[PDB]
Amino acid sequence: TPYFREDPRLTGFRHRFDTVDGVRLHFVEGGRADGETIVLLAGFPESWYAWRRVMPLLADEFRIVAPDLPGQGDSDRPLVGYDTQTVAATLARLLERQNIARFYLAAHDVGAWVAYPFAAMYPESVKRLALLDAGIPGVTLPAALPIEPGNAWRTWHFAFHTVADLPETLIAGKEREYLDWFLRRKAANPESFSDADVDEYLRVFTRDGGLRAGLAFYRAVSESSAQNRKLQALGKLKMPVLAVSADQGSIPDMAGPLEHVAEEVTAATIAYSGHFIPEEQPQALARELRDFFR
Amino acid sequence: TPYFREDPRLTGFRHRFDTVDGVRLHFVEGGRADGETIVLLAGFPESWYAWRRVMPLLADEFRIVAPDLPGQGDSDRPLVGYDTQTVAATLARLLERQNIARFYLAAHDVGAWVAYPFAAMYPESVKRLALLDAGIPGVTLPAALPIEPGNAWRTWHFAFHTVADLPETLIAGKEREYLDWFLRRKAANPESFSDADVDEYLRVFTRDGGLRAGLAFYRAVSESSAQNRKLQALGKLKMPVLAVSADQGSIPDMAGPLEHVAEEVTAATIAYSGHFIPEEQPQALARELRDFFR
Amino acid sequence: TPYFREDPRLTGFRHRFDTVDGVRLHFVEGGRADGETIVLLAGFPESWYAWRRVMPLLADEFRIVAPDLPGQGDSDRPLVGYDTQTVAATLARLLERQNIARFYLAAHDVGAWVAYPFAAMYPESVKRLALLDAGIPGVTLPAALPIEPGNAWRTWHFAFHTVADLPETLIAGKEREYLDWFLRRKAANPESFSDADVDEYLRVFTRDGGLRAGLAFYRAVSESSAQNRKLQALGKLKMPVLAVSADQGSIPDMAGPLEHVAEEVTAATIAYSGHFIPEEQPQALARELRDFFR
Amino acid sequence: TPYFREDPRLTGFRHRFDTVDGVRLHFVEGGRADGETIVLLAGFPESWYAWRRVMPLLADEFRIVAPDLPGQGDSDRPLVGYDTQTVAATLARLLERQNIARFYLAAHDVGAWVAYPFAAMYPESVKRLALLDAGIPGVTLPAALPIEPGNAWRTWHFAFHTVADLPETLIAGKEREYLDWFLRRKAANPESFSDADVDEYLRVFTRDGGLRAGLAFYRAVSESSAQNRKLQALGKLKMPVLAVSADQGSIPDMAGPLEHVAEEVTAATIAYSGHFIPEEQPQALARELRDFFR
Amino acid sequence: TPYFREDPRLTGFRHRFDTVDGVRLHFVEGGRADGETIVLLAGFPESWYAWRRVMPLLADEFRIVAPDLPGQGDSDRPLVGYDTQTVAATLARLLERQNIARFYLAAHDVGAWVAYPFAAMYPESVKRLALLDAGIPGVTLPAALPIEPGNAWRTWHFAFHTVADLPETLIAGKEREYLDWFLRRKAANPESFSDADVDEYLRVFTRDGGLRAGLAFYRAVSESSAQNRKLQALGKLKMPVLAVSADQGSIPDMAGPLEHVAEEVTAATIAYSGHFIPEEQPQALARELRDFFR
Amino acid sequence: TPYFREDPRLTGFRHRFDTVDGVRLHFVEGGRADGETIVLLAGFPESWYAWRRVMPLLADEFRIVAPDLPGQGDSDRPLVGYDTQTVAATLARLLERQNIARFYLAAHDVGAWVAYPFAAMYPESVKRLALLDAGIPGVTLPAALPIEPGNAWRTWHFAFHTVADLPETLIAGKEREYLDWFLRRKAANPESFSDADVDEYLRVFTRDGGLRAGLAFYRAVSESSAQNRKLQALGKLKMPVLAVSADQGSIPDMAGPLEHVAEEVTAATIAYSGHFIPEEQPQALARELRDFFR
């Protein structure tokens, strides 16, 4: 038996590791043993931990799997392979090895970057797709982003992260301030993140290669964009897509651009939420997901 | 007589200060006493010093005035007023007290941001206008800027600079690294800047309020942008305009968008030059200005 | 439902955030659900927390809302808008969004600076006004302040705070010493502030932009003064005004100068109190407010 | 013979020390040996060195003595005695020991605070008096000073310096930043002070008891004010008084207020000068002094 | 009602502050409400806290008032006035404001410096006087002090403290070492001071102006001596005076020299005690004071 | 021949070392090869270097030997033996090994402490004795030294140095400040010590065991005193003694008390000099020594 550990708080959820062609991946699994499976993907600068408030609310009805993608949380941080097709194929191999054959997929922020090529490459495993307050490189994320005061703070980090070496130079010694700004400035209510939450995100941020790996997603975005444009030309996604917005989120209109990549788009807006919907309005989000994942 | 000081290197040029409504401005003046006047404006993260290699080349024929704008170099750094109309009016006042009634105007980078409303507001004062490798807020600077790796590094700083407090936090203790990145990464040949050149820019960067004032221009960009849009609607620019591009500059096409704002646009591209045309190709730029300023 | 959090100490009071035209504001609300409403404003270098000892004494009978103004406590710190007309308009928008249409207003220190243009601009929303130990820019705060050693310490900070860049330079690394001096030297009994109290004020003083925002109120005092003198010429305040001074406070006579801006001015002096009346004599002040707010 | 040292730059001027009732005082003396004597007094945060540009211009005609007052430059720093009557009496004793019985007196800044009670107590020794850009405590210096941003930076330091212990706490580790602000922000042209000039003022500023003694003059101001009114009520000054203003100086009108303390007041304004007239416009000032000291 | 706080350890004693002509003074009061009053004064480097072990032992019989003198403990630290006649007058004003008209006075170390001019100036208010291990400047304190190694350590700090600026320079960064030496080296048993006791003395030693004000008493000693010689020429003290020695104290003979200044001198020596009698032998000292103040 | 080095500035003087019963002593020798010999002794906190300005003035006529005593300058610092009889014996052994049998002796400060038992023990070897501004332990140095603020700064260090361990603790890291105070505060003109002079004394002060050995002289003063009382009881010094005072020196009357220890005493006062006569008035001192040392 492989070693696993029960979460000290999420009763019934276990921390596991699995090594997938040399890449060790951390994931948390639990929930209803006989239920349909939900797979949850998080983004920057977070990890599986972002779903920690939604997971126990859905556990009564669903089987729940929340992995740390390569370069996230406690998973390994390879040197290359942060184009989203490679990340999705690695996720597919992790799920295959855990005998997760078909599931609902909900993905937030950069996690949604991974979810689009995943759904496009393995449509047979994704029964329904929910994308939360995020653009998709090359198909819905615009090639240019606003610079006018009032909106720039929402997207300034995109272009910054693509610059070589300078982000590492400026963030050094200022890691907690950088994280603190990202999390608390984009929430509707900053108290949605405790000091203990920031501590946890700082742990995986400053841990060997965390910053390098986080930036690598942005630095591979032009390759990921070209991949998605090739995939989009094969046809729109056929499975139902839920475009989940937040009334104070980063994306003004989620459903509109997604109608160009999916045949059936259902729109939902979460009230009283900034960008971090799974942590800010877990109940409201759980409700939409449970209702859509049917 | 006010105190003035001869430049230890630019023979015939003198450093002066004048106080304009409580605001002291540093400027360097020289050249042919009987000549037609050229006024030279520089941008971020520089000062009058950016023109130090062009100024002696034109001194034989023209009378040259190179001021530090408010918030630049050795000029004072007021707390507000960095919308470009207020900066332009402050500049106009300085020129009046120096009995500069009519002149040619060449402006680089954020200096060019000031040059557009100045020429729009004081049409008679500006004989001819040269704008060098810069967008003008709200009229030639697009409302959205590239995020593709490969072009995003040219413009990422716009949105970053608009964010409150985070830039001061990240730049602290890394002022030289930040400045060095701007100068050497955006030049075609980084040896266009000696270590002594960087030392001089660092001196004015780190002096009392240097960073604050530099950031203040970007943080006021929505207001300048609206101001420029308002004057935009009042007619095209009166006087002839030379749109100077650099083949490796920040702006792909300078002449094109300026045709939307001026009656007579003359196009010029400086070869083998990055963003810092006055320092990278002084001789070629001086010739273009010498021929256009007739 | 928005996320809110009960105060662990002020039982029956909840911490909330609301976003007003891009600016997120923190506020604490509680008290008797069917009572009349009192709105409480604090000044420098404090926050809503300065009312923490008065709030439970009035909660039996009044509805109580204590917001952090823009630039205070846990509210956002915009880059501009610290002229008190803009701040009062922002506060008005915040109150409207909570359907607080008519209320009693009590304001201390810089809080009173915002309270005056608020009462002048929205007289129908302010049933009665209480101003605590403060002058009002341009109408009751004198244009010159004392320099004699026995009095100069009460007002020296005013002019200091208007200087660009030097205050940030001198306070850096001495934030606690600066805070400690203000709170404990201006109270009649320095033990009115515990170490945990200073810790709390130090937390919000040192958070992103805390010093910048606190200083911005003083740096905009000339615009705030010009605004108030225009409002004063439209007529004096129409609602009853309570001028509360402290026998050891900063202002020798509150009622006197205020008779020129309000029609019915009632005077009260709290004994055994320095400048921080709500923290130094909370019952005495609660009695005066309870009696006046009828 | 006592040890003395020739100034390496001021030809004909010697640095001397003399002990005056336990207090060692440094002074620079030179100029025409049989000429009439000018005594030069400087203020905060300077020393005899502030007169270094005027002294050689007048040395042809006058014997010139430039002392460091107690608490200034290289003179001792007693613990008490910074009320200006005691400082003036100490200066008288120094001059008596150097056989200087009658002289012209020119005094700048806090030096002028010493000059007024000196002139009032020893009228037979002061042939004529020149006061430069300074108010005199209790007589021409107002009891309250302006606070509008625009003129507040000119006088903010007065009240600050009267505060016990906080100025030492805030200035510690920022001595050069504090000095640099005072000298360069208050001059019409900041290049009137070289780096080596700031270095010299920093040397005497950071030397044992330097800050304590400089601040002590402001802290004794109320005693100094009371002394001066006792003298000012005993009759106007008898000798001619030259009130020297600067067009960009700290004080709007010098001659006006001085007409109440002296029978014969002559007005002079030095053009293109900030507060530091002896360093900023030495030739113009020397001409005014030579012309008046007649 | 003024704010007061019960001492967490001393039953029946309250911490208070009162403002006396601008100077806020901290004091601890308690004991038998209708009992006769004892006022207790401490010296360097201590505070009211030095009496904390004697105070409960006398509280059954006497009303007890233990103030921090100006410059001590949590009392304000004015800039000047540490000549002991001025301190005594400040103490007198504090006692009058508390309606303490006639009382017993027991004073230790520099506190005894204050008590002698107090009793000479206000003989009707001092029923009886106890002076503990201290000389009186100019009157019992010798003009020269020992240099022999075996005893010079008892008094070396006297002359050291009068030196300007050098003490601050040497003690900086060594405050705890300096205090520890004073308290523990002069006690007969160094365990008379716990680490928590040293912590408390360090807190008030290192607070704003603590070292400055502590030294000021010694720096004004020649003014205090001249004052005491004038007072002594008016006649010897008429009330009974108790001269309290310690067998290992700083002063070899208390009673001898005091017979020249007081008419009735009672001698007492406390055994097994160093200089800090109130803390080292509280019960023996309390019995002597009780027997003498009855 | 032993290695010796010529002094780089004092031409004709050589630096030498010799070992005396395990203790290396550094000394400088030069002057008239066939002249009579003067041995020169310096004190705290100096070395032979204190005589560098006197040595060349006498070198034309006299043979001059200026040693570093044990614990001074570049000589060894033994662990014990700082009673002045042991030091004098160590000096005697050095002079014998260099075949200096009879000579004039001039001694300053602690050097004079050594000169007295030397002259008392080896009278045939000392032709004449000159003592410069110093008392002699137990015979001329009083057992108590004055503590008026006006005079305590001259002698406070005696008692301080006798305290175990605290001087090392307080002086650590402040060696230059401590030296600077000693040298420049006791000179009539502090410019008698250059920064290079202070550098030289700081070098030997800070050299390993420098502070320990310097303090050891003061810590042994009581043994030295008892030795000196025994020797004096054997008779007055029989050779002529010159008592050299300074008009601003440490010792008010030198010749007076010396009349009790020597048979014939000549008095001389050097004008315009603080304590450090050899450095402050080298020419005046050279003339007096010259006239007496015949």
Numbering used by the authors:
A (entry chain J), B (entry chain I), C (entry chain G), D (entry chain H), E (entry chain F), F (entry chain E): 16 to 309
Sentences copied from the publication:
Here we report the biochemical and structural characteristics of Cfl1 and Cfl2, two Cif-like epoxide hydrolases from Burkholderia cenocepacia. While Cif and aCif exist as constitutive dimers, our hydrodynamic and structural studies revealed that Cfl1 and Cfl2 exist as octamers and decamers, respectively, by forming rings of dimers.
In contrast, Cfl2 shows very low activity against a diverse set of epoxides. The H-G-W-P sequence of Cfl1 follows the canonical H-G-X-P motif, whereas Cfl2 substitutes the histidine with an alanine (A-G-F-P). Each assembly is formed by a ring of dimers: a tetrameric ring of dimers in the case of Cfl1, and a pentameric ring in the case of Cfl2. Given this striking difference, we also analyzed the corresponding Cif and aCif dimer interfaces. Similarly, in Cfl2, the N-terminus of monomer 1 makes several electrostatic interactions with monomer 3 and a hydrophobic interaction between Pro17 and Tyr287 (cluster 1). As a result, within the Cfl1 ring, the three dominant modes include interdimer flexion, seen in the form of new areas of deformation which correspond to its oligomer interfaces that are lacking from the ex circulum Cfl1 dimer (bottom row). This is not the case with Cfl2, where the ex circulum dimer loses its deformability at the dimer interface once it oligomerizes but the oligomer interface deformations do not compensate to the same degree as they do in Cfl1 (bottom row). The lack of substantial Cfl2 activity raises the possibility that it may function as a non-catalytic pseudoenzyme in vivo.
